[PDB]
Design a protein around this ligand. Structure first.
Ligand SMILES: [Ca+2]
Ligand SMILES: [Ca+2]
Length: 678
């Protein structure tokens, strides 16, 4: 199957994601709409249910609204049963229309549809080459008070937030958001926090997602990743990747293109991507708010490409469920159109929040979750997506391409996306009133005459190369032209690998060009993977079995016909199955600004390193207070580990003295190991 094929659940780079609040799209079946106050036909009270369902989505798929738009994957609201009750925050009746207040992760939300409806929707999407991505919010249940934040395991009850004897939840009050630990271990407002170190919860959630992947979901958009321990998440991911690997991204909110240490961290160590708020901010500051210029935009591109191990897996967007719509009264259509184009031709997996093609407005929650107004295919923005979306599939330079600043200034940007012998050039002039005389533009386009892929719908123009040298031209006011160049690759050149972390035995997908149809050999580091280990092999996609080599960070290489492909770095190989173990050290007092890390005899703790590979810095305030620190780590299961803490501050490392501490991990689930600092 090609990298392109709907089948490719491990890579979304060639797709376009359509984010849609299920309830706010189409009530394709009235026979399942809420009754009474908890419902509102008009859908004027955005806080109540409006009727949207899975049949509605099915209908749109079937009349090619999506197929005409160009979107290749739907991102739906969480499908699980949510609380049936209603909460009255400040006199206003609030419903769980959003999907985010789960009560039974093992049952479908009746208001969206049934299990068979869901199955019906998973089959109809694949038939048209559309993938389905789902929201999964394992952080918490529903707001305490609605239903005492109860959780049912497929009907049967697990426990409520109150008189929670076995401790399935956290009872440390709610997060004031003053630190990463305060956000992880304390509730989100009234949202009942689950205690993941609790083993039945750890297993409830591995068992839950398993069910959904089993039914055919193609990707999972995890919610509130900054509110759950990394260690746990990673372990959960290894469970998923070991069963049915699927593209997983999470939401870790940021408020700028500004780099963030914990953000970049999670993005490179959890085993899942993030939503690109750094990008979003720059895309909005330049195109929307007029608070930064093309420089800011370019500066973001280089920096993100530099911070994230695999920038191509981040998920770009111009707006979403947690912000003001891109469109407002001062923002004009061309500007929306420009942001879309910029995003569709950009690096990463892009997502369009529902109704952007219909210029929908709505500032803040919930006005930005208005009902889908039209199914019009005429808008210019609708046009732009249909034109461009298809390119991610046809041109691999858009999909896996690098980015090169080829001409820039305050209003004008011309960047280059190139992968192997393929290219795409994109010129953007955010100035709505004055055009720009471009002189001395240089690209990698072979000599020839190029026609703006956008047929001029965004005042685009044609160009002419002369061995990369483009002839002098004028870029009209508010223009944006795209000129590409494609050809058959003849050299194994790796474009993606999914997932990027796993234990030996798992199956990974390598996407790219020029692999030929004759099984060569894979290279996990310096270890050739051949023959039967290579489950599948064709020009654009090779499915290969992760060899059983020492856990660690490898680079992947595909050698087709003796020619070695380029190397895909930072591919993480696990020791084996994981379990989440909480490490607690006592009397581990420190000096001002001195911190506590952890490392031991397995790649998962960092193989005795004191660097960027050691676990930490351990927490010291919510679950355990200073001088006791603690930190939840993903760690090989069943195996006996040796570990040791260490304080680190200026540059100087002080290891605990005496022998190494020891712990033989549990064969499954979770565990806690307490130790005294030596
Ligand atoms: Ca309905
Ligand atoms: Ca939490």
């Amino acid at each position: 199957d090609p990298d392109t094929a709907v089948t490719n659940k491990q890579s979304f780079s060639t797709d376009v994601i359509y984010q849609v609040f299920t309830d706010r799209f189409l009530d394709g079946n009235p026979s399942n709409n809420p009754t009474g106050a908890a419902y509102d036909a008009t859908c004027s009270n955005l806080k109540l249910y409006c009727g949207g369902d899975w049949q509605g989505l099915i209908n749109k798929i079937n009349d090619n609204y999506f197929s005409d738009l160009g979107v290749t994957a739907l991102w739906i609201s969480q499908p699980v049963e949510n609380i049936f009750a209603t909460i009255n925050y400040s006199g206003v009746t609030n419903t769980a229309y959003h999907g985010y207040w789960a009560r039974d992760f093992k049952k479908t939300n009746p208001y969206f549809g049934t299990m068979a409806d869901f199955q019906n929707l998973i089959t109809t999407a694949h038939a048209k080459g559309i993938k389905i991505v789902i929201d999964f919010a394992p952080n918490h249940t529903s707001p305490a008070d609605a239903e005492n934040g109860r959780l049912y395991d497929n009907g049967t009850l697990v426990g409520g937030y109150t008189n929670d004897t076995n401790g399935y939840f956290h009872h440390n009050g709610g997060s004031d958001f003053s630190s990463l630990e305060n956000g992880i271990y304390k509730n989100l407002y009234d949202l009942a926090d689950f205690n993941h170190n609790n083993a039945t919860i750890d297993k409830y959630f591995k068992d839950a997602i398993k069910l959904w992947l089993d039914m055919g979901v193609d990707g999972i958009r995890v919610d509130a990743v900054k509110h759950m321990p990394l260690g746990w998440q990673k372990s959960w991911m290894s469970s998923i990747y070991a069963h049915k690997p699927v593209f997983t991204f999470g939401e870790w909110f940021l408020g700028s293109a500004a780099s963030d240490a914990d953000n970049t961290d999670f993005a490179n160590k959890s085993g899942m991507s993030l939503l690109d708020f750094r990008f979003n901010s720059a895309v909005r500051n330049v195109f929307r708010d007029n608070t930064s210029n093309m420089y800011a935009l370019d500066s973001m591109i280089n920096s993100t490409a530099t911070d994230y191990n695999q920038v191509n897996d981040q998920v770009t967007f111009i707006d979403n469920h947690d912000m003001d719509r891109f469109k407002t009264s001062a923002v004009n259509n061309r500007r929306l159109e420009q942001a879309l184009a910029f995003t569709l031709t950009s690096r990463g997996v892009p997502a369009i929040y529902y109704g952007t093609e219909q210029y929908l407005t709505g500032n803040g929650d919930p006005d930005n979750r208005a009902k889908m107004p039209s199914f019009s295919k005429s808008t210019t923005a609708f046009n732009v997506i249909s034109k461009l979306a298809p390119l991610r599939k046809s041109n691999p330079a858009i999909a896996y391409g690098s980015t090169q600043q080829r001409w820039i200034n305050n209003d004008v940007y011309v960047y280059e996306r190139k992968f192997g012998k393929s290219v795409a050039v994109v010129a953007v002039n955010r100035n709505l009133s004055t055009s720009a005389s471009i002189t001395g533009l240089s690209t990698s386009l072979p000599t020839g005459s190029y026609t703006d892929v956008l047929g001029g719908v965004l005042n685009g123009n044609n160009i002419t190369s002369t061995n990369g040298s483009i002839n002098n031209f004028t870029l009209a006011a508010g223009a944006t032209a795209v000129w590409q160049y494609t050809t058959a690759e003849t050299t194994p050149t790796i474009g993606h690998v999914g997932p990027v972390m796993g234990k030996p035995g798992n199956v990974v997908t390598i996407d790219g060009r020029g692999f030929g149809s004759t099984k060569g050999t894979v290279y996990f580091g310096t270890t050739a993977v051949t023959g039967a280990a290579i489950t599948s092999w064709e020009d654009t996609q090779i499915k290969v079995t992760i060899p059983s080599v020492a856990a660690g960070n490898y680079a992947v290489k595909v050698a087709a016909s003796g020619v070695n492909s380029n190397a895909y770095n930072n591919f993480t190989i696990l020791t084996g199955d994981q379990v989440t173990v909480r490490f607690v050290v006592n009397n581990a007092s420190t000096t001002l600004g001195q911190n506590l890390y952890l490392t031991g005899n397995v790649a998962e703790l960092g193989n005795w390193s004191t660097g960027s590979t050691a676990i930490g810095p351990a927490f010291n305030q919510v679950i355990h207070q200073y001088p006791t620190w603690y930190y939840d780590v993903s760690v090989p299961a069943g195996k006996q580990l040796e570990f040791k803490f260490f304080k680190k501050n200026g540059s100087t490392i002080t290891w605990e003295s005496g022998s190494n501490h020891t712990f033989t991990t549990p064969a499954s689930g979770t565990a806690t190991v307490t130790v005294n600092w030596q």
